[PDB]
A paper describes a structure:
The 26S proteasome is composed of a 20S catalytic core particle (CP), to the ends of which two 19S regulatory particles (RPs) are attached. The cylindrical shape is formed by four stacked heptameric rings, with the two inner ones composed of β-subunits and two outer ones of α-subunits. The multicatalytic properties of this proteolytic machine are provided by the subunits β1, β2, and β5.
Remnants of a tryptophan- or tyrosine-containing octapeptide stemming from β2pro can be seen in proximity to the β2 active site. However, because these densities in the unsymmetrized late-PC map differed from those in the C2-symmetrized map, we analysed the sub-dataset using cryoSPARC’s 3D variability analysis and obtained two distinct conformations we named late-PC1 and late-PC2. We conclude that late-PC1 is an earlier assembly state than late-PC2 and that the octapeptide represents β2pro remnants. Our late-PC1 and late-PC2 structures suggest that during β7-driven dimerization of two 15S half-proteasome precursor complexes, the maturation process initiates with autocatalytic activation of the β2-subunits. We speculate that this density might be remnants of β6′pro or β7′pro, which were cut by the active β2-subunit, as it was already suggested in previous studies.
Author numbering:
A (entry chain 3): 1 to 125, 132 to 148
B (entry chain A): 2 to 242
C (entry chain G): 2 to 206, 209 to 248
D (entry chain 5): 3 to 113, 116 to 143, 163 to 267
E (entry chain B): 1 to 249
F (entry chain E): 1 to 250
G (entry chain 4): 1 to 39, 41 to 78, 80, 85, 115, 118 to 276
H (entry chain F): 1 to 234
Amino acid sequence: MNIVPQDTFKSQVSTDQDKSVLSSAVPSLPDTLRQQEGGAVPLSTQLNDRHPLESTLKNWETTQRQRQMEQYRQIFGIAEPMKRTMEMEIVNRTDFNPLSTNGSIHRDILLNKECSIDWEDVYPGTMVGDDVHSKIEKQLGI
Amino acid sequence: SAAGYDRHITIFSPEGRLYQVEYAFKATNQTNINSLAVRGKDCTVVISQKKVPDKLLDPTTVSYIFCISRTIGMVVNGPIPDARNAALRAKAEAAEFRYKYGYDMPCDVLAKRMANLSQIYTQRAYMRPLGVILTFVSVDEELGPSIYKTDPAGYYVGYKATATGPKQQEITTNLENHFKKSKIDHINEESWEKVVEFAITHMIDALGTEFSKNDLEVGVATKDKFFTLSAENIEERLVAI
Amino acid sequence: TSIGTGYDLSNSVFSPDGRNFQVEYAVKAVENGTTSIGIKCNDGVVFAVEKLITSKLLVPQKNVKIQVVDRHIGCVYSGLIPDGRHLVNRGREEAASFKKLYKTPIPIPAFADRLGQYVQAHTLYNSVRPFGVSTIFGGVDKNGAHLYMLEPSGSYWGYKGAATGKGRQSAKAELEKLVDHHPEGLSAREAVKQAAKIIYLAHEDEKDFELEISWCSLSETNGLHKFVKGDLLQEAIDFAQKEIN
Amino acid sequence: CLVLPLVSVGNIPQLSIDWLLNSQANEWEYLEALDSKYLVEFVGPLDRPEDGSDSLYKDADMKYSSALEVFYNKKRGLFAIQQRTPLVSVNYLNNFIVEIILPFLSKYNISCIWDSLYAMEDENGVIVRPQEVYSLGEFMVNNWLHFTPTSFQDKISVDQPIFKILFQILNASQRPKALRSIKYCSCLANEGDNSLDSQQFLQWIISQKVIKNAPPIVKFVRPISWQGAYGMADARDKFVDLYN
Amino acid sequence: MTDRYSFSLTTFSPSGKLGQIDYALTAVKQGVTSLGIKATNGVVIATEKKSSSPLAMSETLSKVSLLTPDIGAVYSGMGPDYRVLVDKSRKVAHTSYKRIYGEYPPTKLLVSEVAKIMQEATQSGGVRPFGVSLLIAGHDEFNGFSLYQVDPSGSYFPWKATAIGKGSVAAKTFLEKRWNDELELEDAIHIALLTLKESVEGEFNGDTIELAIIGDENPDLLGYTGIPTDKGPRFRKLTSQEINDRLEA
Amino acid sequence: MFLTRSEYDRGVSTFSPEGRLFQVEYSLEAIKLGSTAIGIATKEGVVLGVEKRATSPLLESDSIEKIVEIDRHIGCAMSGLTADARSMIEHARTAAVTHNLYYDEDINVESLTQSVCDLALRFGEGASGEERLMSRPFGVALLIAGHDADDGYQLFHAEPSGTFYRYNAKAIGSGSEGAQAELLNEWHSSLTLKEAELLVLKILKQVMEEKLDENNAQLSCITKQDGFKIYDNEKTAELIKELKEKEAAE
Amino acid sequence: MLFKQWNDLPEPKHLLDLPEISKNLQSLEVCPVPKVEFPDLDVPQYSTAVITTKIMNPLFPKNLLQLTSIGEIKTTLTVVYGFSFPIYSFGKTLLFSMEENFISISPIFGNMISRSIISQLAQFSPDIIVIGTSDKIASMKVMTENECTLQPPEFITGFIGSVLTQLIVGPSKGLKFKCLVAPSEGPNGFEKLSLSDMGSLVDLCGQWLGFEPSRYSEECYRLWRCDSAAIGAQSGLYI
Amino acid sequence: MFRNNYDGDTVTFSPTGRLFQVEYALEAIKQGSVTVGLRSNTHAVLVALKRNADELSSYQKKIIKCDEHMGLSLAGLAPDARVLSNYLRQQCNYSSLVFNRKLAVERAGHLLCDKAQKNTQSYGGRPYGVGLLIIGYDKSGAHLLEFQPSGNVTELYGTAIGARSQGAKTYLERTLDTFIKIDGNPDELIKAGVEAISQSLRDESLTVDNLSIAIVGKDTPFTIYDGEAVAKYI
């Protein structure tokens, strides 16, 4: 029953915390070239000096969804949140469009956002990566 | 029947049809009961048939009429598990609409929402449609008395009056003849009791052989509340002509 | 036709007649289980189970065939043992959560609806299997005594008397006779005697058997679910043996 | 008339033969064992009707059953073939028609063929009427058979074995003269437990009077082997940790 | 894991054809007839209403939908897919164009967005293609009036006049013999009524056919006065009384 | 009573009617397709020996690596699919180095073998309850030879099923049957290191199609003081010549 | 696992995935049949013949018996297929060992080889013992020409099925035989056995071959556990 | 034949209402060697017969220690035995760490049943194929439990599982009143267990290599005897 998102800070760090981009030469260290972030961005710099509202905005919709699921569990039972989560997971897992980033129509219907617009909708948004094969590897887990 | 696929999932056949949707449609007549919905001047009446062949059953626990919100009632044709699933989802939809937009959910908007969910089920491969037919009745603050029906294919539409069941054709023909005679798309009565009696009379003359107070279920929607009648109320309505 | 070829290899598939054959196969699995009955009296419920005798190595007090979902809710089931255990655990979780949230024992219809929704959700996807159990549960709440039966399809109903398992036909016939012979109602002790009689009569299959009975009545157990002590169980067994021979 | 079932989808023809040989066990007796060079070899016990009637094997010193057997019904004068295993390869199908079936037909001066089709594998569009279930024919793609208007097909694909059987029978340089007509009964079905499907197929074949001498069947009887179709006959009671 | 993917529901047949798209086209061809006629002063879009029973209120369900005040659409095929795609198009008109440029999109760009949405359903692992065909009529400042047809595969083409549905071939021939570069909006409406008269088996009156026009701006439909530069909607749906009056004449 | 087709041997998570997993059996069959590896454990060290199957004479002699060093006190021999053995060897090396990092000691040979077997279990549920990592069982078998202070010199056999055994002598690969029979006949607890080397060479020569020489066979040993070493071609050739002279003496 | 693939519909199981003799499936002619040539040998010199498959090799230890090769049965098919079928002898007993392989070898070769062997052996009526496996039986079976212990729907197929068919309904009816059948699982040429079934096979084979129990059982046990094909993953998978 | 069509996975019922993959998993227990468990009011013991790959190999471990007051013995698959033993160890450790409490044997059985039932109703995995015998001593005394991988747990005074375990079970049934009263004498109970497991031997003799014993009790922490430690009980 949370309104404002809570527990947004990291509690542990490591040099292999990002499994997607790890060096093949030294598997315990991240791959700076394939990160494509400017090459001078250590992970430690991401732990300080953030805008206070950024974490609230990034996790807002997930928090509202979790509160709705908790209310359904309290009032309806386990089956209702189970079914909602199953529907959403099936819809999300069957969609794979490497050339587009827009959400599906059915996802919007399930989220009850058929006729709703937020700034995420208006503003949806290299040398290495950003290709179809990287998305294939990330999606399949290989 | 389906040759290869189309026996499990909802994809097109060579004829351009969705066999799983049609089979879900055929699944709606398993209960072999009928329901009727009519509009009054300021009320909407739904009457459903009760069949309790088993003598060990508790009759008071058998019902296909559900209360969705303060103003909306629903009648389901089909097996009771999918009926209860649909009822719970409709309750959640109405409550969320009220929370999100600041006013009560209208009957037609809820019908459209359920139909959109049904469209999801008809297009996704790993989802099956619910083999039920839903009928929502209310007295909308803008549109007056309202009856809207939704089916497994995702199609929804509003009705002056409607009937659904294995014997829906006879009731539909009788209603059409009556509305031809009266030239009015509703019932000209000032109380919902007269409308209930008229619906009971229509059901009796359409199905035949009549019934007692325990073979019927009646729900009535007014401008303020939707409520289901009890056995004594139905007995009074049967006695009163 | 009982066997639908081409439409019985997946859970969430409609047949051309609008039937779900995996649920019906689960029903057939239920119909082979041990006989269980439930009877609703004027102020409570009685449950009876035809237990099959086993090796002497079993600890006598650690193998009970009637499960207590909560202090006012008791249930029995026929079908697959793991499915029954899973459903009993889910029912206990639901009752505990309801009592924590609303500071009162859960009403029987609310419990029945939650259990039925959980069962029905397992007929929706091809990655799960319908439950192979049918459950007879009941108890007492502020509105009185309630007895329900729940099927693998998620369909549940309230009953005056319910029977499941191999000997379901004879048990149902005896329950119908009992209901007909008592239009006014029934008492808890008469219900226990008749439950013993019905369990004894329904048995028809060289194998010795024992009987378990359970009460939940306002006047007898203060609205709580209890087992049967030696005296009442012995009296009911004597009545049943007189009925048989 | 000789009834030749084919090893097809669901083993429906073979199962139907079982019905025909157990529901009317009085009229049927074991006659002969054919050569099984082109089949997968088979040895097993003697099957008997479930209801307790006498075995179709009247000989007392025979205790084994082979892959390919021929039964005879003198009251109706009908020959039936029961085949336990499929052909070693489709390539030898021709041989099976030429060196086995035709010599038997010539030897006994016999004056139908039972089959099933799977709709998902219809790559030539021979199913023109999916509404109906059965097809009856009498005598790329071929049009040598005359199917009834109520059949689901009007032609046969060249990939089907029935076309090869027809070609071998018609083009045989020394085919028996006593052979007059060919009948072909086929059904559309799906794999699974096809006992009731086979019963309905046999009922349709008998009702249509495809074979004149075939009498109607009222009480259907299974053999005793079908009791082991799901494994041990009393296996469910063994698993006390699962069923209760 | 074997659930991190799902195989494609639309694949190439050996002849080089996508079977699901062809079956969706068949489903479209089994639908009710709809048509569009493009004139010098406007575009007419028309269709035949259908009802499961006479007791249904045909005005509750409308096959003609306003996408923007200057763009409307009609259909042939399956209704729920229509409803889903219309809602999506109405949302996309705002998210992609009006929240960026302050103005509604031209007809062609909205058609392109709808067609992209439809195409993404033919390269998926868990949705079938939309079994529906679209007619979109519109007007914009730098392109004038336009009429487009969108197919289930996501291909769209501009037409001077066209029809889709069960009676599409005969309607196409009748429109071929009755179109010219100097037609007017009223002439187009009359031709559309005549063409629909050849396809409706039952009652051809104002309660069984549905028409809408893209014509001149209607300041009486704005809902407010005071701004001379605010143009009214050009999309207008004809009432049943107007259709009856035109049929009588 | 008809002959149909059974399909219980195609999925790793499907039981046969008698409760068997046939994909594991077929993985063992894949193991038997590889070359032969023999290990003999004595009181003076453990000897490992492999046969190099060179399909073409153009293949580099020092390219087939059937014997690897997991750690200074632990060596391994492999038979089966080399691609899977590569991953298994990488995991074993990582485990040994991590144990040294966190405990400042050598890891027990049995602990390393158990870790490798826990990795091999990954086609199903993991030992600690982890989700499935791969789609099929490995097609390799390992012989792990080591020495530690707790248990002396040990030789373990690790299989794709996730189970390992302790052996006095063990042969895997194509010619494993005759080699294992010879090991059963010719092993005793009082063997020396040189006798073990000669026995390994003799059994390899017996079970090898080609004439045994320094280029199609490889020897290695692990001892407490010198650690794990792989003999060069000159030492193995000298051993082969001594074996030939001993055979020709009779 | 959220779902299972929609397109994983099982193939109908009335078809056995057996090797194809010829690539041309549209042929209208008669496919050629393999020719079998049987060896020089003195059949009367041996009073007993044993017919079985390779999976039963541990039942016949080499050193304990006097197993010596005498010749090879030659089977040739041209459409070109060639095979060799070595024959062994110990004491006065013959041994025909068949190498089944459901991937590489068609059953037609087994049928023809069984026909040739039975035709050659029927001219002298020796003692015939058949040892084989079946996937359709519940427990071990001992059968003769007078009694069949199989209950329906159990049956025997494969090369041993071919041999029994030739001995029962072939052109050489009446030859007495003893058949020992053990339960197994797996495709032909890749079967597996239980340890108890292996022990029962060893005991009954020793009793029928007239050898001392202890030494024969020891040798057979050692051969069974020496990475035999029938004990593939038993030790490592079950504890 | 008809069973062949409906035994693909654990989410399929046959038309007669049978779940064949679970039955096959239950049948997988017979491929393992025999283990016996028994107990009295004071002590609980397990006896196991171990098997080796061949003469040159070691013997398999059949008894695994979970906690100072609880242990188990296996019959069936090796991977599932490893998984379930590790899971029970984790649960005991969690109980001790969070509550300073000894995990009850009944609680462990319930947790095992809950974990086992899941794999028999969802697609993508397989049911477990190992039977377990769990002995322990807690605040309610001595406990013996039999876990069947269908997801079932039974509480008994004595039992046996594995290949040819029927003879040992019959012997335990016949002499229940004798060993049920052996209180304060661990040796007598262990010898009774050895005699019980001797009924299941076929052409085999118990040696110091193939016999493993485990005991737990009021003052006895769970202890495993192997090798010469069992020579006195032969």
